Amino acid sequence: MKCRVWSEARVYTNINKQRTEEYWDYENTVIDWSTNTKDYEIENKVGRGKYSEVFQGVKLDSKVKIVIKMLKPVKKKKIKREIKILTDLSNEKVPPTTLPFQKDQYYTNQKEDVLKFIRPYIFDQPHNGHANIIHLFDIIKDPISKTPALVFEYVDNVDFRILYPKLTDLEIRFYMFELLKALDYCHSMGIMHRDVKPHNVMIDHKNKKLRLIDWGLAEFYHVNMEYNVRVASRFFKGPELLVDYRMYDYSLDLWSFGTMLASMIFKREPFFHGTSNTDQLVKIVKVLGTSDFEKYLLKYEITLPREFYDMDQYIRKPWHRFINDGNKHLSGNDEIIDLIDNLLRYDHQERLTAKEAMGHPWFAPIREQIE
Amino acid sequence: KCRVWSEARVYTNINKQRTEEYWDYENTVIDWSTNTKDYEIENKVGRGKYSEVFQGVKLDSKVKIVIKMLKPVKKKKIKREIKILTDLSNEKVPPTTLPFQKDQYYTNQKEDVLKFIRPYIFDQPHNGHANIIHLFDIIKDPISKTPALVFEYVDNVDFRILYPKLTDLEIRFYMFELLKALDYCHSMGIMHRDVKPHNVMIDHKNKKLRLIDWGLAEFYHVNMEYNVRVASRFFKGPELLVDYRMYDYSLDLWSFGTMLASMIFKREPFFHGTSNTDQLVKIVKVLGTSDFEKYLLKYEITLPREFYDMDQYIRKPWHRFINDGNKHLSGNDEIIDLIDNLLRYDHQERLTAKEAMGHPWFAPIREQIE
Ligand SMILES: Nc1nc2c(ncn2[C@@H]2O[C@H](COP(=O)(O)OP(=O)(O)NP(=O)(O)O)[C@@H](O)[C@H]2O)c(=O)[nH]1
Numbered sequence: 001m002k003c004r005v006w007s008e009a010r011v012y013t014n015i016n017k018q019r020t021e022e023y024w025d026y027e028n029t030v031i032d033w034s035t036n037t038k039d040y041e042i043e044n045k046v047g048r049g050k051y052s053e054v055f056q057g058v059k060l061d062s063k064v065k066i067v068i069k070m071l072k073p074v075k076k077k078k079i080k081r082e083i084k085i086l087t088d089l090s091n092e093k094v095p096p097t098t099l100p101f102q103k104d105q106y107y108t109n110q111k112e113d114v115l116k117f118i119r120p121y122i123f124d125q126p127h128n129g130h131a132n133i134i135h136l137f138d139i140i141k142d143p144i145s146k147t148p149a150l151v152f153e154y155v156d157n158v159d160f161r162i163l164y165p166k167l168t169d170l171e172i173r174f175y176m177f178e179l180l181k182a183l184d185y186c187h188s189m190g191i192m193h194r195d196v197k198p199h200n201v202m203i204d205h206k207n208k209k210l211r212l213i214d215w216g217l218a219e220f221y222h223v224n225m226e227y228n229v230r231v232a233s234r235f236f237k238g239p240e241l242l243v244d245y246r247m248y249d250y251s252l253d254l255w256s257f258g259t260m261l262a263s264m265i266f267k268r269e270p271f272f273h274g275t276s277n278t279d280q281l282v283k284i285v286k287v288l289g290t291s292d293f294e295k296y297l298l299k300y301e302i303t304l305p306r307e308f309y310d311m312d313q314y315i316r317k318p319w320h321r322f323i324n325d326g327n328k329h330l331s332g333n334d335e336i337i338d339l340i341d342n343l344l345r346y347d348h349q350e351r352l353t354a355k356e357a358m359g360h361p362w363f364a365p366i367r368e369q370i371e
Numbered sequence: 372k373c374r375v376w377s378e379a380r381v382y383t384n385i386n387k388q389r390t391e392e393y394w395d396y397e398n399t400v401i402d403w404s405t406n407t408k409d410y411e412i413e414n415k416v417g418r419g420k421y422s423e424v425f426q427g428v429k430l431d432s433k434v435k436i437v438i439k440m441l442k443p444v445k446k447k448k449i450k451r452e453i454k455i456l457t458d459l460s461n462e463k464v465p466p467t468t469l470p471f472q473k474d475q476y477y478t479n480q481k482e483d484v485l486k487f488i489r490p491y492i493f494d495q496p497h498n499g500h501a502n503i504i505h506l507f508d509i510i511k512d513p514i515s516k517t518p519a520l521v522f523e524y525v526d527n528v529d530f531r532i533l534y535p536k537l538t539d540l541e542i543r544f545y546m547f548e549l550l551k552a553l554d555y556c557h558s559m560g561i562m563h564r565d566v567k568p569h570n571v572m573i574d575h576k577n578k579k580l581r582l583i584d585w586g587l588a589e590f591y592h593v594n595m596e597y598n599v600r601v602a603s604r605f606f607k608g609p610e611l612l613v614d615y616r617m618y619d620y621s622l623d624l625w626s627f628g629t630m631l632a633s634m635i636f637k638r639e640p641f642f643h644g645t646s647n648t649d650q651l652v653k654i655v656k657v658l659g660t661s662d663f664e665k666y667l668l669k670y671e672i673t674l675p676r677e678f679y680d681m682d683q684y685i686r687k688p689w690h691r692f693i694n695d696g697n698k699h700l701s702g703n704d705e706i707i708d709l710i711d712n713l714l715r716y717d718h719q720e721r722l723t724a725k726e727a728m729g730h731p732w733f734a735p736i737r738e739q740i741e
């Protein structure tokens with residue numbers, strides 16, 4: 001037990017007490033691999049990452065386009081985990097987020113100090129966030145090569161560095177709302193994504209379609225579990241990961257979301273541009289400031305890792321400092337600044353939840369168009 | 372059209388020295404290869420306003436090529452692109468490989484233009500000719516009659532992916548390579564007229580840069596009035612926007628400068644017009660109304676009608692664009708001075724390619740030449 005002060009999710013705290021081993025015990029699953037690779041014709045390469053090479057293909061049966069994620073070698077339990085998470089998310093008959101909202105089943109952390117973080121706004125309607133999770137269609141393993149592969153639905157994506165600069169204010173609102181729906185759903189299912197970033201969000205702009213992909217670092221949330229902090233990707237890592245506060249939760253994803261948002265709105269990519277793991281924290285504290293950083297360390301009685309003792313003292317950078325004529329069409333309103341400010345907080349408990357964020361004034365033009 | 376006339380500061384008389392067989396592209400007969408069988412087209416590598424571009428292979432040599440399939444345009448435009456490409460590749464002794472002759476370089480001898488001569492200049496031979504894309508063939512399928520240009524292949528990555536990865540020294544390197552290319556084509560009496568990132572192919576692993584897309588390029592002729600509907604919006608110089616038609620090679624240095632400002636200050640594009648009209652607005656919002664008006668007066672330019680809803684703007688100092696996201700590129704006096712001397716309303720005031728190459732900012736690159 002690394003952590004000194006313990007922490008629990010503010011919301012969806014007890015999903016994996018409600019659900020049992022058959023849902024979350026991925027280690028003790030048996031993967032029924034399809035031997036028949038002849039069902040799929042692999043065509044061009046569509047991307048790559050730390051854990052795979054990804055190709056677009058065709059299911060010969062139906063001629064439907066698919067993608068095939070050819071998995072690099074990793075521990076077998078990591079493959080079981082990705083598959084179990086994907087199947088849990090796609091196979092849920094009645095997604096919790098489509099049911100009527102129950103405040104008292106939602107805000108489940110009843111510590112007096114955590115309840116002061118409940119926002120006076122919240123998105124309290126059913127929504128289709130489950131439809132923004134990528135669908136896993138098949139799991140294949142060549143009998144010769146023995147390469148495991150995941151077959152997904154295909155999304156017609158453009159690199160974020162090409163697409164995002166083209167997006168209007170309203171379009172950013174739209175897509176980031178879609179992403180929040182996806183996160184509200186997976187969190188409602190007791191799952192943390194743990195790698196929210198642009199390359200893990202596929203957008204087919206002509207079909208106004210968004211899919212949250214790459215569930216290979218996702219985990220099930222268990223109360224007071226200490227997780228590995230070497231997850232997510234550098235620029236999107238929350239302060240909890242960097243200071244080795246292991247008892248984190250779904251709120252990690254909201255920091256990552258917030259960093260994506262700040263980059264889009266302020267047109268600084270990435271927003272927190274660490275040149276190393278150590279420097280990632282420096283880049284964050286250079287904005288949010290040493291004062292609130294210290295208060296956060298004190299709140300959780302965090303022993304700061306050794307590497308961070310060469311950090312200088314930094315005064316907070318007000319968000320308005322990042323506004324300029326190149327981005328004022330996106331950044332020049334009080335709503336977006338308040339939204340970003342309420343996502344990017346050292347203390348993971350202080351951060352907006354996905355539902356709270358969805359209820360924020362900035363998304364009003366999007367919510368107005370729902371009905 | 373123009374009231375005050377203007378001539379290039381340098382390389383002014385190239386196309387008086389060279390004759391019709393060099394610059395008269397209208398009166399060329401293009402010998403199209405009709406076979407097509409020589410080339411196997413593979414995947415698409417890009418597109419533009421004038422083409423769809425595919426990579427492929429020359430079957431005999433197995434060499435990788437690109438094939439630029441030309442969209443319909445006036446036949447003289449195709450003759451022009453080809454003539455410029457062949458002029459540039461076929462020059463036996465590129466002028467820029469010869470010893471520098473100051474007297475043959477600074478050819479505009481007006482007293483007021485001579486004060487723009489910089490106290491620094493790159494005065495050495497260089498290999499800028501090797502940074503021009505090589506045209507290998509010209510083919511036309513007899514069935515579709517689609518004209519196409521076959522080039523060398525460059526293994527390029529989108530600038531929006533690549534440029535953010537580049538170090539200060541690497542930007543210095545590549546932008547020096549680009550200046551060599553422009554010095555060469557200018558020395559050959561050719562204006563590129565569409566300098567922008569999508570027209571600059573970079574194979575970063577091979578530290579290789581090629582200036583491509585010569586389809587809007589033209590031959591420079593003294594006091595010729597050119598179409599101003601050239602280049603691409605974000606890179607258009609003020610001369611194009613105010614319809615000052617008697618422009619020259621210095622147009623390319625504005626475009627170069629806008630590319631550089633975007634890389635250095637990490638604002639892409641640097642001058643982000645939402646329309647032709649607004650493009651000028653975005654420029655004047657930086658450089659300021661005062662110098663804009665002095666420029667109009669210098670050339671007695673009748674400002675086009677569309678620009679009379681412009682407000683009054685005070686110049687934005689360059690240091691205003693420096694921030695913690697870009698200070699590793701922008702935080703020295705050299706780069707600020709270089710940018711300042713490229714992005715000038717008055718085309719005559721701008722650094723030439725050779726002057727830019729001699730600038731203090733490129734010192735670390737020049738130090739590594741010998
Ligand atoms: N066009 C398209 N590209 C895809 C699709 N799915 C994945 N990709 C591409 O393949 C990349 C890698 O897929 P991903 O599942 O993130 O693999 P990973 O190896 O786990 N990546 P990471 O390093 O972030 O952990 C994506 O970032 C994307 O560029 C898709 O449906 N369409």
Ligand SMILES: Nc1nc2c(ncn2[C@@H]2O[C@H](COP(=O)(O)OP(=O)(O)NP(=O)(O)O)[C@@H](O)[C@H]2O)c(=O)[nH]1
Binds near residue numbers: 421423424439527586
């Ligand atoms: N990878 C690669 N791509 C190329 C190469 N040559 C051209 N392209 C791609 O094809 C695009 C179009 O080529 P270009 O000759 O600029 O065509 P154009 O129709 O005249 N474009 P514009 O609209 O700028 O006038 C380039 O911007 C680039 O993306 C090459 O050698 N390698």
Ligand SMILES: [Mn+2]
Binds near residue numbers: 049199200214
């Ligand atoms: Mn990924």
Ligand SMILES: [Mn+2]
Binds near residue numbers: 195214215217
């Ligand atoms: Mn992954």
Ligand SMILES: [Mn+2]
Binds near residue numbers: 570584
């Ligand atoms: Mn082009």
Ligand SMILES: [Mn+2]
Binds near residue numbers: 419421585586587
């Ligand atoms: Mn062109």
